[PDB]
Write an enzyme that holds these catalytic residues in place. Structure first.
Site, PDB file in Angstrom:
ATOM      1  N   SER A  36      39.598  40.305  51.165  1.00 38.65           N
ATOM      2  CA  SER A  36      39.073  41.669  51.287  1.00 38.65           C
ATOM      3  C   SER A  36      37.669  41.762  51.882  1.00 38.65           C
ATOM      4  O   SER A  36      36.778  41.000  51.513  1.00 38.65           O
ATOM      5  CB  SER A  36      39.073  42.369  49.921  1.00 38.65           C
ATOM      6  OG  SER A  36      40.340  42.293  49.280  1.00 38.65           O
TER       7      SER A  36
ATOM      8  N   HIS B 168      34.663  33.610  41.691  1.00 37.01           N
ATOM      9  CA  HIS B 168      35.558  34.003  42.781  1.00 37.01           C
ATOM     10  C   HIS B 168      34.971  33.707  44.159  1.00 37.01           C
ATOM     11  O   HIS B 168      35.708  33.385  45.088  1.00 37.01           O
ATOM     12  CB  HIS B 168      35.933  35.490  42.653  1.00 37.01           C
ATOM     13  CG  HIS B 168      37.093  35.908  43.509  1.00 37.01           C
ATOM     14  ND1 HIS B 168      38.325  35.297  43.454  1.00 37.01           N
ATOM     15  CD2 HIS B 168      37.207  36.894  44.436  1.00 37.01           C
ATOM     16  CE1 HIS B 168      39.153  35.884  44.309  1.00 37.01           C
ATOM     17  NE2 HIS B 168      38.493  36.854  44.914  1.00 37.01           N
TER      18      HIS B 168
ATOM     19  N   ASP C 124      37.387  32.323  36.892  1.00 34.48           N
ATOM     20  CA  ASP C 124      37.932  33.280  37.857  1.00 34.48           C
ATOM     21  C   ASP C 124      39.125  34.022  37.215  1.00 34.48           C
ATOM     22  O   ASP C 124      40.269  33.532  37.198  1.00 34.48           O
ATOM     23  CB  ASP C 124      38.367  32.556  39.131  1.00 34.48           C
ATOM     24  CG  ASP C 124      38.474  33.484  40.310  1.00 34.48           C
ATOM     25  OD1 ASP C 124      38.530  34.708  40.087  1.00 34.48           O
ATOM     26  OD2 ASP C 124      38.483  33.000  41.463  1.00 34.48           O
TER      27      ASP C 124
ATOM     28  N   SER D  44      42.013  34.970  48.210  1.00 37.02           N
ATOM     29  CA  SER D  44      42.025  36.240  47.474  1.00 37.02           C
ATOM     30  C   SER D  44      43.229  37.045  47.948  1.00 37.02           C
ATOM     31  O   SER D  44      44.369  36.604  47.762  1.00 37.02           O
ATOM     32  CB  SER D  44      40.719  37.023  47.689  1.00 37.02           C
ATOM     33  OG  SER D  44      40.451  37.923  46.619  1.00 37.02           O
ATOM     34  N   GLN D  45      43.003  38.179  48.610  1.00 36.75           N
ATOM     35  CA  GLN D  45      44.124  38.980  49.091  1.00 36.75           C
ATOM     36  C   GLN D  45      44.977  38.228  50.116  1.00 36.75           C
ATOM     37  O   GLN D  45      46.192  38.419  50.191  1.00 36.75           O
ATOM     38  CB  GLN D  45      43.651  40.319  49.666  1.00 36.75           C
ATOM     39  CG  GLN D  45      44.804  41.170  50.193  1.00 36.75           C
ATOM     40  CD  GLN D  45      44.392  42.550  50.640  1.00 36.75           C
ATOM     41  OE1 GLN D  45      45.248  43.353  51.052  1.00 36.75           O
ATOM     42  NE2 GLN D  45      43.090  42.846  50.576  1.00 36.75           N
TER      43      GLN D  45
END
EC number: 3.1.1.74
Length: 197
Positions: A26, A172, A159, A104-105
Site C-alpha cells: 500500500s 511491519h 507484526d 503486505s497487500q
C-alpha cells in the site's frame, strides 16, 4: 528505480532464462516499492543482467489503503493484472523458470493471483517469497494451491497483520534485512534445483 518493466517490453527473440514478478505494498511508489529493488540486484548478480527479467505489478494494481478491507485483502482488478503477467511470461518465453514475491497487500495479491492461476503455468514457478503476509492466519501460512517446499513467508514478531488483524505496528516496516538476503537466496536456490544450473 522503483519501476522495472522487463516482461511487458520483453523481446521474445531474446528471452531471459528466469523471470521475477513482484507486487509492492500500500502507498508504495513505482511497481517495485522499497523491497523490490533489493531482491532484483541479487538476482542479476547470481544470474547476470542477461539472465533475468524483473517485472513489477503496476498497471491496474494501485496499492490502495481501503482495499485491504476487501474480501481477499485486495481488489478484483489487481488480481487480473498479476494473473495477466504470468500468462504473458509463459507466452513470450515458455522455457523460462518463473519466480514471484510480494509485500503486505502485494503479499495478499500474490497469494490470490497464484491461487487463480492455470495449473500448467503455476508449476513453472520455482519459488515464492512473501513479506508481512496479511492473510497468513487466514490462509494458514500457505498459498492456496501452492506447495510447501516452494513457499517462504517472513513475519516478524509483533507484526499483528500476520496474526490476523489489520493493526499496523512498527515491525511491519522492518523487512529490509530479509529482502537483502534470505529472500533472494531462497529464490536462487529454487531456480537451480528445478533446472540444473
Amino acid at each position: 528505480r522503483t519501476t522495472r518493466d522487463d516482461l511487458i517490453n520483453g523481446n521474445s527473440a531474446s528471452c531471459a532464462d528466469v523471470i521475477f514478478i513482484y507486487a509492492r505494498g500500500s502507498t508504495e511508489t513505482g511497481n517495485l516499492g522499497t523491497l523490490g529493488p533489493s531482491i532484483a540486484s541479487n538476482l542479476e548478480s547470481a544470474f547476470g543482467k542477461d539472465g533475468v527479467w524483473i517485472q513489477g505489478v503496476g498497471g491496474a494494481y494501485r496499492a490502495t489503503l481501503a482495499d485491504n478491507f476487501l474480501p481477499r485483502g485486495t481488489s478484483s482488478a489487481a488480481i487480473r493484472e498479476m494473473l495477466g503477467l504470468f500468462q504473458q511470461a509463459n507466452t513470450k518465453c515458455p522455457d523460462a523458470t518463473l519466480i514471484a514475491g510480494g509485500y503486505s497487500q502485494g503479499a495478499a495479491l500474490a497469494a490470490a493471483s497464484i491461487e487463480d492461476l492455470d495449473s500448467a503455468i503455476r508449476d513453472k514457478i520455482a519459488g515464492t517469497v512473501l513479506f508481512g503476509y496479511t492473510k497468513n492466519l487466514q490462509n494458514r501460512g500457505r498459498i492456496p494451491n501452492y506447495p510447501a517446499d516452494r513457499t517462504k513467508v517472513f513475519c516478524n514478531t509483533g507484526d499483528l497483520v500476520c496474526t490476523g488483524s489489520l493493526i499496523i505496528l512498527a515491525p511491519h516496516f522492518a523487512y529490509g534485512p530479509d529482502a537483502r538476503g534470505p529472500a533472494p537466496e531462497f529464490l536462487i536456490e529454487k531456480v537451480r534445483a528445478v533446472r540444473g544450473s
